[PDB]
C-alpha cells in the first residue's frame, strides 16, 4: 500500500480496475450389451456458456 492517493490513481488508471481492493501486500437373439449406459453429453454451463 502507501499509495499516497496519486501513485494509486496512476495505478488504477493504467490497470483499468481497483488493485486497492485486491492488494499484493497481505496484511493482518440376446441383447447386445454395452459396457455401461452411453454417457449423457454435458450441459452448457448456465452462468457463462461462452467466455
Amino acid at each position: 500500500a502507501s499509495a499516497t492517493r496519486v501513485i494509486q490513481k496512476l495505478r488504477n488508471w493504467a490497470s483499468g480496475q481497483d488493485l486497492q481492493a485486491k492488494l499484493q501486500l497481505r496484511y493482518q437373439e440376446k441383447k447386445a450389451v454395452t459396457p455401461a449406459p452411453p454417457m449423457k453429453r454435458w450441459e452448457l454451463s448456465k452462468d457463462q456458456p461462452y467466455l
Binding site: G16, Q17, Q48, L51
Partner: protein, 43 residues
C-alpha cells in the same frame, strides 16, 4: 479440540469470472485526433 472450520454462516463470495474491462476511445474518434494532428503539423 477446536477444529478449523468455515466461519458460521459461511465465508463471503469470491470472483471466479474475468473482470477485464472493455475500455477504449472509439476508432473514428481515435483516427480523427491523429489526422487532425498531421493536418496542423503540415500547415
Amino acid at each position: 479440540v477446536k477444529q478449523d472450520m468455515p466461519p458460521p454462516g459461511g465465508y463471503g463470495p469470491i470472483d471466479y469470472k474475468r473482470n477485464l474491462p472493455r475500455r477504449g476511445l472509439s476508432g473514428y474518434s481515435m483516427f480523427a485526433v491523429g489526422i487532425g494532428a498531421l493536418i496542423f503539423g503540415y500547415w
